[PDB]
Design a protein around this ligand. Structure first.
Ligand code: HEM
Length: 152
């Protein structure tokens, strides 16, 4: 669990993301693929994207980014109470896409990195700490649900 003040910090930084989901999503995804290209193979859709510049120019990729961030944000706003929200995602990653927890750890890394590149002033040791926990809480919940469905 997280304290109330930790959630406030998560939520306080989330509001900044909210002023530019599209812009934040793209950085996040680019970062992820760039640092861990093997994750790129899960996306047949994006696989042909050769450079950054081209990643950046892709409408598809940017629309995907907003989707990813939108679901995430909905989860965080629940401060722990997100089973309803979370379930569809575990179901699909266990059953359809097969995304390993490890991949979820790399994406959390990319998130942290972006938030810090964009909002250093609202992203200190204390917030960063809080965000980490929040993302770890999601990953742990996901992990359990995955197992209940038969997927590592
Ligand atoms: C914060 C973590 C993430 C969130 C909230 C998230 C959310 C979503 C959402 C909401 C969708 C659309 C519906 C669905 O297919 O279930 C999706 C699709 C997908 N996700 Fe993620 N995702 C996350 C991380 C990842 C990671 C780390 C990977 C692995 C490399 C991944 C691979 C995919 C793929 C391949 C699809 C199919 C999308 C498409 O083809 O339209 N996702 N994700």
């Amino acid at each position: 669990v997280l304290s109330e003040g930790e959630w406030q910090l998560v939520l306080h930084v989330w509001a900044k993301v909210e002023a530019d989901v599209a812009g934040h999503g793209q950085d996040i995804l680019i970062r992820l693929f760039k640092s861990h290209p093997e994750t790129l193979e899960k996306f047949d859709r994006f696989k042909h994207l050769k450079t950054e510049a081209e990643m950046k120019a892709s409408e598809d990729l940017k629309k995907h980014g907003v989707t990813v961030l939108t679901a995430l944000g909905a989860i965080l706003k629940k401060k722990g109470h997100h089973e309803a929200e979370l379930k569809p995602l575990a179901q699909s990653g266990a059953t359809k896409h097969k995304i390993p927890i490890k991949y979820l750890e790399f994406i959390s890394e990319a998130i942290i990195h972006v938030l810090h590149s964009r909002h250093p002033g609202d992203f200190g040791a204390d917030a960063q700490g809080a965000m980490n926990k929040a993302l770890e809480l999601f990953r742990k919940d996901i992990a359990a649900k995955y197992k209940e469905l038969g997927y590592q």
